[PDB]
Amino acid sequence: KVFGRCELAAAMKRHGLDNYRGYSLGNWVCAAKFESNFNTQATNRNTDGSTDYGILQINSRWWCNDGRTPGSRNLCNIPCSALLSSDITASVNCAKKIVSDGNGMNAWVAWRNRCKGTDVQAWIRGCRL
C-alpha cells in the first residue's frame, strides 16, 4: 500500500510515534518518505546481503528474520515479510525498539541525511490531527 502523507501521519500517531523518544511526528513521516516513499511494500538490498523492509526500511541485519541474512539477529522477533503489510503496526512497534537502541533516529541514514535539522513539521502541515 502507498500511504498518503496525512494518512500515514494519522496512522503513526495512532500507534504512539508522536514524540516517541522525543521525535515529533514530522520526523517519522519524513523518514518514511525518503526511506520508502510511503510504500509499505518497499524492499532494498544492502551491500552485506541484508535487506530493508517496509515503510521504514527496517534492516534484517538486526531486527527481523528473512531466512537469508546469515549472521543476523531478529530483535523485533518478527518475519521481515510482516513489515510489508498494509497495516503498519509491526513496523511501528519495531521502529520503537530501533529508536530506543541508543542512536535515536540516526539508526535511519536517510533520516540523518535528509530530515535531521530540517523543518520536519512541514511533513504534517495541514493534516487533521
What are the residue numbers of the active site?
35, 52
Grid coordinates 501521519 are at which residue?
A: 9
With respect to Cl ion, which residue has the nearer C-beta, 6 or 11? 11
CB of 107 to Cl ion, least distance (A): 21
Nearer to Cl ion, 11 or 82 (CB): 11
Q: Which amino acid is at 117?
A: G
Positions 8 through 27 that interact with Cl ion (CB under 5 A): 11
Q: Decide if residue 119 touches Cl ion (CB under 5 A).
A: no
Residue count at the site for Cl ion (CB under 5 A)? 3
Do the Cβ atoms of 114 and 34 come closer than 8 Å? Answer: yes
User: Are the CB atoms for 58 and 80 separated by under 8 Å?
Assistant: yes
Could you tell me the smallest distance in angstroms from the CB atom of residue 102 to Cl ion?
Answer: 27
Q: Alpha-carbon distance 60 to 50, whole Å? A: 6
> Within its chain, how far is the Cα of 121 from the centroid?
17
Q: Smallest gap, in angstroms, from Cβ of residue 4 to Cl ion? A: 12
With CB atoms as reference, the residue minimizing the distance to Cl ion is 11
Ligand-binding site membership of 101 (annotated): yes
Residue of 31, 56, 88, 120 that binds Cl ion (CB under 5 A)? 88
The string of DSSP letters for 56-108 reads TTEETTTS-B-S--TT---TT-SBGGGGGSSS-HHHHHHHHHHHTSSSGGGGS
Output 92 or 107, the one with its CB closest to Cl ion: 92
Residues that bind Cl ion (CB under 5 A): 11, 87-88
Question: Which residues are known binding-site members?
Answer: 101
